[PDB]
């Protein structure tokens, strides 16, 4: 499901992140050798962590927000979020006619736009495959005409099967709440819910 925000529900401008913390969580078997060399082995999967802080929420906005959150807690599905700082539409066009040749594993990826896309995805922008819900981060870009060579920080979780389509816009993190067990909201005498915050965490 979709986390409410001013893009989906413009009538509630109180929704919307006062501050978002996009943390990098890659567990590693780090070992500090006696000779000065540091050896680290990556085994556990990496996952983005999102910490959302909300401004002063009025009673109706908080009613909508916690209604959506409780629906999340009820039906048990995943909770998608859209970070707005990465919503710079730097790539126009429709990506259905873009083919990613099969048999690709690792950080590097090669995709052929077939002369369809307009706009260059600069380093630091997000990237997501059509099938898998993992969200990557472009670290370097290099194109030779139509073919694009993109390097992603997390290695491709699944090897491309030749049908996965690039998603350069409207990327949603498939996250799970981490504050659900004890989630309280305080109501002031001024009439606003203060200090509403979420500690999300990408699942899979």
């Amino acid at each position: 499901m979709r986390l409410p925000d001013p893009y989906t529900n413009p009538e509630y401008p109180g929704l919307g992140f006062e501050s978002v913390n996009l943390v990098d969580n890659d567990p590693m078997i780090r070992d500090e050798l006696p000779n000065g060399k540091v050896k680290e082995v990556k085994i556990s999967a990496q996952y983005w962590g999102i910490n959302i802080s909300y401004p002063e929420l009025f009673p109706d906005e908080y009613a909508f927000l916690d209604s959506r959150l409780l629906e999340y807690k009820r039906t048990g599905d995943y909770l998608d979020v859209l970070l707005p700082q990465y919503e710079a539409f730097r790539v126009r066009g429709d990506t259905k006619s873009v083919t990613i040749p099969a048999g690709q594993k690792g950080s590097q990826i090669i995709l052929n736009t077939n002369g369809t896309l307009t706009g260059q995805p600069k380093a630091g922008d997000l990237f997501k495959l059509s099938t898998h819900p993992k969200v990557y981060k472009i670290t370097n870009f290099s194109s030779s005409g139509n073919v694009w060579n993109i390097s992603l920080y997390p290695d491709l979780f699944i090897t491309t099967t030749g049908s996965e389509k690039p998603v350069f816009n409207g990327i949603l993190f498939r996250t799970k709440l981490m504050n659900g067990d004890s989630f309280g909201s305080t109501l002031n005498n001024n009439g606003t819910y203060s200090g509403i915050s979420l500690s999300l965490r990408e699942s899979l």
Partner: protein, 298 residues
């Protein structure tokens, strides 16, 4: 249309169901205002420019009156309302504050054409007057909780201040020995109350007005200004040493504030003519401070 002139006004204080129209009023100052909760919800989605401000409370008003002394001594009711105990025409400062909450009263500020401003839940928080070479006048300071605009009002036709008392030079004594070279005797009395804000979530979408308050302390104080005068070399009566306990009285022909035992601190200023300044407060075990109000012929 109807303008509102300060000179064309009448201030009536409503206590116990009777209107105390305080004539002989030299000048008064008051203001009304509201409290707002203005927050700006700038977000990464929309870095907005328009605030979210709602008016939810009335800021307490601070009304100050300057009242001349009068022959009917209605102005002593300000000491009476501020907490002093009464015996005859003399007001005592009680050893302990009588009640937790002050004495509440309403006040009207009348004007022409049925125009009025209604201050409610008022209490007298300050009264100070300077006995000097000018006509004495006591500036009272009251704090309101709720102000309002009303059409009909209470007007004190009968209860009113009489003629102003003629000037009479002040004199300060120790027992019956006069203190020489007086300049300006200033007396101060206070009832330092505090508003108990009880704005709760049941008052959301409503305007809140302060209603209840409690007395933090009462006190009587006086600052005496003299000229540094000595009659002997190494004098004992007049010097700069502190006096732990000494009977003092700041006397006039129409008023006499008595400190049965006083704690005096002295301060010398090397000005054009040397001036000493006293700081008179009653002691710990001193008897109640007296304030006599003599209309005429004592």
């Amino acid at each position: 249309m109807f303008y509102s002139l300060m000179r064309e006004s009448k201030i009536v204080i409503e206590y116990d169901g009777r209107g105390y129209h305080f004539d002989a009023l030299s000048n008064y100052d008051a203001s009304t205002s509201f409290q707002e909760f203005k927050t700006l919800r700038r977000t990464i989605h929309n870095r907005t420019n328009y605030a979210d401000s709602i008016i939810n409370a009335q800021d307490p008003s601070s009304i100050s009156l300057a009242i001349n002394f009068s022959t009917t001594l209605i102005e002593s009711n300000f000491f009476d309302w501020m907490g002093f105990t009464r015996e005859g025409n003399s007001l005592f400062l009680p050893r302990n504050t009588p009640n937790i909450e002050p004495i509440m009263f309403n006040m009207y500020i009348i004007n022409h054409n049925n125009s009025c401003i209604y201050f409610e839940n008022c209490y007298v928080s300050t009264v100070d007057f300077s006995l000097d070479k000018s006509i004495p006048i006591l500036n009272v300071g009251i704090e309101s909780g709720k102000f309002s605009e009303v059409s009909t009002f209470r007007d004190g036709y009968t209860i009113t201040q009489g003629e102003v008392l003629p000037y009479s030079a002040p004199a300060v004594y120790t027992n019956s020995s006069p203190l020489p070279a007086l300049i300006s005797a200033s007396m101060s009395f206070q009832q330092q109350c505090s508003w108990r804000e009880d704005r709760n979530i049941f008052d959301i979408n409503k305007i809140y007005t302060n209603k209840r308050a409690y007395v933090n302390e009462m006190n009587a104080s006086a600052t005496l200004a003299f000229y540094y005068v000595k009659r002997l070399v190494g004098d004992k009566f007049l010097n700069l040493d502190p006096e732990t306990r000494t009977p003092l009285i700041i006397k006039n022909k129409y008023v006499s504030i008595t400190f049965p035992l006083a704690r005096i601190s002295k301060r010398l200023n090397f000005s054009d003519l040397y001036q000493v300044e006293y700081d008179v407060i009653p002691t710990a075990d001193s008897d109640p401070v007296e304030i006599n109000f003599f209309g005429e012929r004592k």
